[PDB]
Amino acid sequence: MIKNEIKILSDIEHIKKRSGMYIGSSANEMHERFLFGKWESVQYVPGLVKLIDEIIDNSVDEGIRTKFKFANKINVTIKNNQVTVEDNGRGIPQAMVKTPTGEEIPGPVAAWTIPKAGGNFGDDKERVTGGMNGVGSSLTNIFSVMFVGETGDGQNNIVVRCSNGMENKSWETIPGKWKGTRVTFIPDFMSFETNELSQVYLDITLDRLQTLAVVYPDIQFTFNGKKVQGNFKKYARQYDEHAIVQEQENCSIAVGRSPDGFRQLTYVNNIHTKNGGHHIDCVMDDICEDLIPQIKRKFKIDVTKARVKECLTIVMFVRDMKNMRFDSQTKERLTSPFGEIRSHIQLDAKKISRAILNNEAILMPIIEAALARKLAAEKAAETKAAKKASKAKVHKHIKANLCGKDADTTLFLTEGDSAIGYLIDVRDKELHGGYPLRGKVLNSWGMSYADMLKNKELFDICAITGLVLGEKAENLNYHNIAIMTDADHDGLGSIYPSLLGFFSNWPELFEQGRIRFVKTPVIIAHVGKKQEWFYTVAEYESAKDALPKHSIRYIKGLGSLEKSEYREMIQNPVYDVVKLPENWKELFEMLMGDNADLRKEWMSQ
DNA sequence: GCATATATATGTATATGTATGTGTGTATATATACACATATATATATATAT
DNA sequence: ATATATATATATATGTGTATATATACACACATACATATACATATATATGC
Ligand SMILES: Nc1ncnc2c1ncn2[C@@H]1O[C@H](COP(=O)(O)OP(=O)(O)NP(=O)(O)O)[C@@H](O)[C@H]1O
């Protein structure tokens, strides 16, 4: 039975038991992130990046609260699983703050050990800093095995040292003359689904310092002792080199191209709100409210707001926001009221609209892609037909009238158009269907399905019958198959084995016994008062000797014959039943194929 | 303040394994686009008319 | 105020000519190349080592 008891925890146990509430994701996961202007797939833990960004945003907010005179250099050094963030701010105060429990705890140690403490619990409408909750650097202290905070206000140095996952904590005061904050912490890896800080975390932190230096050029961010220059122009051309830019006193927006989905990046003050907010929705609404009637008058096309928006990458920057509200601790969605953001943001949407209208490299690709979609929609027009003949029929394909239904209908394969003009009278109208072919027949051994349906004639054979290249022959329009390749040696040794090797792609036609070859004489000789027939030349080469005086006729083809002998060979045929044996595959490989040393040893016998 | 050492990054040069030949004609068939004129035909454009 | 009578230049088409082209199998046993990558040497340099 499920136990039902109530545990009332402290702040520390509620944080450590419910970690995913307070650091975001505590699991290694994949995302698609803009790194250095590139939409690259990353795989990382957002919790440790969030822990770095808490101290980073604390140092930046120390920058804003002194109006960028202090905390104007921020050193974020990440090496050997150790983050050292040092700024030259005025200092976390040494003055006496009081707990509600009655314990008298000094300033930086109450800021850095217990949560729900900080200097952002005052008025919200004048607070322009990215911090609200008062739990952040204490959350950095909680998920770190080692955490030292060295604070100088100019008169004293307060060292707050915590260890064993803040279970050991001690504050100490030295007389000194430094003025700034140094947070040096080594993260805990027992709760996170990682063990070390890899290069993707340092790349995310360096790209964040680059974006913050773009937003705040006065604060000199350094990573591992290397300076970072932030300009909106080079950052905007890192995304797309044709991005239209527009900078304001608080906003800075760049519009580019998104060919493989939708891309975005937005910053409210110093916060990376990667999941959005009301601000990007209001800015795209104000942009599309000018652009959509403009593209309607320009190119007369009905393209929606989302279809315009999804091809754009928008890199917009919001500075000095007031009363910022966020739906989570990680602050990834600005859920301030739309009147507040609409009053604060003074972005000129019509200038961006005319600037992307006058550009031919962003809007005109949306126009040509949309008319490509509409032309592909217009080209797909089909209807029905009254008793379609042999499904996809052919110009030279005569058809049996009971073909396709339940019957024993036979399809005819010849190579001559002269050898079918006699057929339509001498055949049955219901069971006999004739079709010639152009020239000889492709060597089709071991080669791809696409390269065999590139032939008009081979997909045409597939279109007459029920033959599909990748599956079995079950429902066939002509039940039987009767092939008449030409009677000469080129007509039996080049087109006929290539044809039956093509029919070897479905090795059940031979098994059903329906493969019939119709014999055709190549020598017809008048001897006595009668005509003797010879299917092969070697039949005559055996039987030339023991015959009397005669008048020969070599038979070039069935078109060289007359309608009477045509009627004889159709209405009384000779059906060679070609049966596939066991090892047909190696025999076809040694005949129809690239290697011919097999043909070398095979001719030699 | 200076030895130094080795590490890895990029020339580089070769040696792999393929990939495309086309060879060079024989052989098999098929397709193409024009000029020469009357004879229908057809199909749809205009008039009108109440 | 549009239905229809009707007229007229569109579409083969005949045969004669006069000329093009094109997909394939054949096979060596190389020919030229297509990249190509790849492993390894060495340079410098810089940051450690002293
Ligand atoms: N590295 C730092 N630089 C400047 N101020 C800091 C730093 N670390 C802590 N603080 C301050 O110490 C107090 C502790 O609050 P903290 O726990 O960091 O929450 P926060 O800043 O409100 N962030 P959050 O809880 O996520 O909204 C705040 O007044 C911070 O501004």
Written account of the structure:
This protein has 605 residues and is α+β, with helices and mostly antiparallel strands. The protein contains 21 helices and 25 strands. An 8-stranded mixed β-sheet has the order 9-8-7-10-4-3-11-12. Strands 13-14-17-15-16 form a 5-stranded mixed β-sheet, with helices on both faces. Strand 15 and strand 16 form a beta hairpin. The longest helix has 22 residues. Bound molecules: phosphoaminophosphonic acid-adenylate ester. The site of phosphoaminophosphonic acid-adenylate ester has 24 residues, from helix 3, helix 5 and strand 10. The structure holds a DNA duplex (50 and 50 nucleotides). GO terms for molecular function: ATP binding; DNA binding; DNA topoisomerase type II (double strand cut, ATP-hydrolyzing) activity; metal ion binding. It holds the Pfam family DNA_gyraseB. This is DNA topoisomerase (ATP-hydrolyzing).
